[PDB]
Design a protein around this ligand. Sequence first.
Ligand SMILES: Cc1nc(N)c2c(-c3ccc(NC(=O)[C@H](O)c4cccc(F)c4)cc3C)cn(C)c2n1
Length: 256
Amino acid sequence: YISRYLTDFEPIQCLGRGGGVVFEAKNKVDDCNYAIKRIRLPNRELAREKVMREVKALAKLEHPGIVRYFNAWLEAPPEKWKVYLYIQMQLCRKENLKDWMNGRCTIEERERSVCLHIFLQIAEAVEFLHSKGLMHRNLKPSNIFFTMDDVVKVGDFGLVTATKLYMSPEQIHGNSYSHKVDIFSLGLILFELLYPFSTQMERVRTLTDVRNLKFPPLFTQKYPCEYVMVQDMLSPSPMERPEAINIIENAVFEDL
Ligand SMILES: Cc1nc(N)c2c(-c3ccc(NC(=O)[C@H](O)c4cccc(F)c4)cc3C)cn(C)c2n1
């Protein structure tokens, strides 16, 4: 009849394709642009109560590696011919980690100091979520962001409502059983951060190999201690993989 989203915000564009939709909308009152995730909630009533308990425990979250929350509200519009859950989140930089990485193809432009710094933020963000008994399960360059303050942000996660390149095996076939799946994703990210790429062909080919622990020799030589971690993080038996804390507490994560 009269939508909360339509009255309070004037849309700019769309950003994300749902697995729900994500718009860039200016709040008219405070005249700031935000990322607004629109979700179609489950018609099953008891599945809904679970989703709400999550937004309740999600709103609580506050961490520098986590995107800033603002407001969450519901809309039950008239069937044009269903209830939506809108979520207002801090709008991040148009250049995400994927965009950033595909702008820097030289092993120089991937300076060791900058890459370890970036990854640590991603690692710390997961430590936090893991400490709260939460798992991200959407870790990939396409869904890692920078603020207008150049601070790294682990992207959209949670509120599942029931590329697989960074997904762990058990995540691709199974129920994504353990939080370890995030550790695995971190592994491939750290690699791709350190090891540049020329083509999508190379990216896919090399990463598909690195998934099965086939590392370019140039890498293993140049970065030996990181290679130890990336192995540990990719360890094919999840239980073998380090906890988010163990990664942050490493010799490499110092001298900065
Ligand atoms: C430019 C930009 N900025 C963003 N913030 C985004 C996002 C985005 C990133 C993160 C989330 N949500 C979250 O991180 C969590 O779901 C969450 C929810 C409530 C409270 C929390 F503390 C955390 C939701 C979007 C749309 C997705 N896309 C494509 C974006 N694009």
